[PDB]
Amino acid sequence: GEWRELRYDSTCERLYYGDDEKYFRKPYNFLKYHFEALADTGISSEFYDN
Amino acid sequence: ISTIQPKANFDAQQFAGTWLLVAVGSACRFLQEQGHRAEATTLHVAPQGTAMAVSTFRKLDGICWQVRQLYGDTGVLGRFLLQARDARGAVHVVVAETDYQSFAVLYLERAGQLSVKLYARSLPVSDSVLSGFEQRVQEAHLTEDQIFYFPKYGFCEAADQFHVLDEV
């Protein structure tokens, strides 16, 4: 899911993404490995003054 | 493939500072199609030993980018090797015809194919100089149809921390 990686080519002046590491081989012992991109963040701030 | 003469008695501190790309001459597919992704491209140069340290700058899809490379010297004055950084191998860079105050014509080489570039210090170029670039393209055995004149406005410099490739 992350194969997207920038490369320049100085001959003929192009900026293009590498086409390297697009696939990985899965070992037999792994049923599924899924390359799902998630984030979650949770922030709590509490201030009390007397 | 053939040899063209590098700039006789070249000086790297005279090539230093800012430059702007006018045009590219090449047989490369990604100019004769997808040419709407030609964008306004400029250089900053600084000498580092006999080698020249190069930053190119470009807009990639409205975001300004910087690209960082060494013109590592071959030990011949005005010839450089692009430091062999990735699986394409190395590119030879030859400074062919220039004056440090106005214009530079470069030859760049890979896979037995020549390619060429025209740069200037400021936005326009004299018709005799641009005709000289067309003749250098014809002398490279390329067509004038293989010349691509890049966007004449909207250049950028000083891309952010996250928008520099760090290729060296």
DSSP type of residue B145: T
Burial state string for B105-137 with b = 16 or more CB within 10 A and e = fewer than 16: bbbbbbeeebbbbbbbeeeebeeebbebbbebb
Which residues span the domain enclosing B60?
1-168
Are the C-beta atoms of B25 and B142 separated by less than 8 Å? yes
Q: Strand pairing partners for B106?
A: B95, B117
Residues 41-70 of B with CB under 8 A from A: 41, 56, 58, 60, 65, 67, 69
Under DSSP, is residue B24 helix (H, G, I), strand (E, B) or coil?
strand
Domain containing B8 — which CATH number?
2.40.128.20
**B31/A13 CB distance under 8 A:** yes
Tally of structural domains, chain B: 1
* Experimental method reported for this structure: cryo-EM
Structure tokens of B102?
Answer: 């106005």
The 3-state secondary structure of B17-62, one letter per residue: EEEEEEEEECCCHHHHCCHHHCCCCEEEEEEECCEEEEEEEEEECC
Helix, strand or coil for residue B54?
strand
Q: Are A31 and B49 in contact (CB under 8 A)?
A: no
Please report the resolution in angstroms.
Answer: 3.3
> Which residues in chain A touch residue B41, judged by CB atoms under 8 angstroms apart?
13
